[PDB]
């Protein structure tokens, strides 16, 4: 019993969008979704943020798989990760959008680059803790491979403690699928 909201980076840098969708797919199909099971909402961000669908638009695990594979990349001349997370926190995770009172809030952030708005990331993360939201962050290192160090510390600072059981690291958009297993069986 836990409402899951995936915060997808859809900026110009993300490529190809096919592997990102293959990731959602391979992850969302292993879940039992329902009003009394586990709900999932997806938010995409770039220069701006947009709700793909709310936590309770779909009550079936299959209805979620079809809608998911229907998500289009919106692009973006910036990677406003802070804006994306903060928007999921105070907009997605709200009763109005399907958040279930009492249930555990879980946020999944996937990005491939340092955010342009990293100056409000600290504040945004702290507000996620204050609302007790478990955070799992996934960093795609493609574009950097340039040290990925500072990039890594930023994405980690997004995941909840302990970092080791919340933060993931993949070589590129293709390697995203090699996480679904560990990712899921760690959200239990």
């Amino acid at each position, epitope marked *: 019993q836990l409402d899951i909201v995936i915060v997808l980076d859809g900026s*110009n840098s993300i490529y190809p*969008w096919e592997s990102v969708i293959a990731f959602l797919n391979d992850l969302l199909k292993r879940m039992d979704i329902g009003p009394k099971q586990t709900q999932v909402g997806i938010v995409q961000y*770039g220069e701006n943020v947009t709700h793909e669908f709310n936590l309770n638009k779909y009550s079936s695990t299959e209805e979620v798989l079809v809608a998911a594979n229907k998500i289009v990349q919106r692009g*973006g*001349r910036q990677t406003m990760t802070a804006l994306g997370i903060d928007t999921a926190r105070k907009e997605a995770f709200t009763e109005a959008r399907g958040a279930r009172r009492g249930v555990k809030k879980v946020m999944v952030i996937v990005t491939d680059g340092e955010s*342009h708005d990293n*100056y409000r990331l600290k504040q945004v993360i702290q507000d996620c803790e204050d609302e007790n939201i478990q955070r799992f962050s996934i960093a795609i290192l493609g574009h950097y491979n340039l040290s990925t160090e500072k990039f890594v510390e930023e994405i980690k600072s997004i995941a909840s403690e302990p970092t080791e059981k919340h933060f993931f690291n993949v070589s590129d958009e293709l390697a995203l699928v090699t996480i679904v297993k560990a990712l899921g069986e760690r959200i239990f």
Partner: T-cell receptor
Amino acid sequence: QIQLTQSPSSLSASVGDRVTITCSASSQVNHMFWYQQKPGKAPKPWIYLTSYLASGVPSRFSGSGSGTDYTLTISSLQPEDFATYYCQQWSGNPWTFGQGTKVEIKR
Amino acid sequence: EVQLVESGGGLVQPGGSLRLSCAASGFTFSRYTMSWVRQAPGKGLEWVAVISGGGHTYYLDSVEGRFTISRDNSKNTLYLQMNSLRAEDTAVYYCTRGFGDGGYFDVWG
């Protein structure tokens, strides 16, 4: 929207002099970029991610800054550094350049 | 080595149309977001349009509705279709490769 103002608009210095160009943004940005342009030629990538030198850029060049103030510094002005230097930001739309600093060499 | 080469410039009358093209080489073109930057005579640089590797396009106000940026990955070429040209559009147009979300102009022709 973010506007960049470079200062000085132009400057004159002697070889060996330590020169520092400034770029102030109308709103904070977390990175700045610079390009060098010589008369009649395409701009050249000079400094990116605030302080990384593009391949081929001699070691006397460096970049620094944060918030709304970023700089480009030449530790020992050489005669070959005369040019117009442009700062540029990718944090606000539309992406924009500073009006540039034209640097000349004394003799 | 990585390289870009602009083409299509010339004299055109006010109200006329003109199509610019840019051939890229030395890198995996389709994976990069590309842009066009212009410089009017005796003035500064001005970003004009951008297209991501995903096909998403963005524009500078003064040209949106008149210029159209496109790309053809089978030929590793970038295009800029310019309509309703005005005297203020006079300038040297540069094809340019972007880094990250495209805002850092990595390569210039």
